[PDB]
């Protein structure tokens, strides 16, 4: 997970324009719509029966806020993602039983949401930097599985 200085600055500049609560809700909802088997962790969230039921689901939205909030905090620690996400990794393994493939899927959905929101501003070099970030975060979240 090696970002160039230019990439680090592009990551930070774009993220400064991100509504984390909104983007989080959008990314988690899109995950559950695009890859509907990921709904398996969210039985208690109620209606997930159609794209609109999922995207507008208040529990999905609330959960997306939490998830992207933790992601956002991690962007301040790009040189130590494994340490940053160690307790969340342990939690998702031991208590939540979430296959880490889910982290990879969410990363790619998040990249789509950023593209959708930012349009031409989400350039190929900006995407490439975010691909490094999202791979690093997924790898960090998978790291304490056992």
């Amino acid at each position: 997970v090696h970002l160039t200085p230019e990439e680090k600055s592009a990551v930070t500049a774009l993220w400064g324009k991100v509504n984390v609560d909104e983007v989080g809700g959008e990314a988690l909802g899109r995950l559950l719509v695009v890859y509907p088997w990921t709904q398996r962790f969210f039985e208690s969230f109620g209606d997930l029966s159609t794209p609109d039921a999922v995207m507008g689901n208040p529990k999905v939205k609330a959960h997306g806020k939490k998830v992207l909030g933790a992601f956002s905090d991690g962007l301040a620690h790009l040189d130590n993602l494994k340490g940053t996400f160690a307790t969340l990794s342990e939690l998702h393994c031991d208590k939540l039983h979430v296959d880490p493939e889910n982290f990879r899927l969410l990363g790619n959905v998040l990249v789509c949401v950023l593209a959708h929101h930012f349009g031409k501003e989400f350039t190929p070099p900006v995407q490439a930097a975010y691909q490094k970030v999202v791979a690093g975060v997924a790898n960090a979240l998978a790291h304490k599985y056992h």
């Binding site: 890859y35 509907p36 088997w37 398996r40 393994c93 039983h97 979430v98 493939e101 998978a142």
Partner: protein
């Protein structure tokens, strides 16, 4: 695409497995849980202790499904229809895991079939398990 020659190899190899199928199914699961610990996230409700009767019982079910698939190798989407429904709608196992079980099934076969596990047979069994996996994930979305 399973060729007629693949089907020949699969039928011959599974024939040799014979009544050991259930045992090898359990061994493949044990190997998968140890080698690829993320797959345990699908079995938190299981007893995963050494020699777990629950794991052994499940390996028998996996093995029987494979025996059925071999017996109906020309018509696998039909033979496996209820199992495909189950994995798609209820279990919702991420598709990436099917390659992990398939590999562990191959390793198990290799470990028990010194004479039969030729390069050609290895190739055919890999294709077969990939085909099974394709059918089991066909209804996911």
């Amino acid at each position: 695409v399973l060729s007629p020659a693949d089907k020949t190899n699969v039928k011959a190899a599974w024939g040799k497995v014979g009544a050991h199928a259930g045992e090898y199914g359990a061994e493949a699961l044990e190997r998968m849980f140890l080698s690829f610990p993320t797959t345990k996230t699908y079995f938190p409700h299981f007893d995963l202790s050494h020699g777990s009767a629950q794991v052994k019982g499940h390996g028998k079910k996996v093995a029987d499904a494979l025996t059925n698939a071999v017996a109906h190798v020309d018509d696998m989407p039909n033979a496996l229809s209820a199992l495909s429904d189950l994995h798609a709608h209820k279990l919702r196992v991420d598709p990436v895991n099917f390659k992990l079980l398939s590999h562990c099934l191959l390793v198990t076969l290799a470990a028990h079939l010194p004479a039969e596990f030729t390069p050609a047979v290895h190739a055919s069994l890999d294709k077969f398990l990939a085909s099974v996996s394709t059918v089991l994930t066909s209804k996911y979305r």
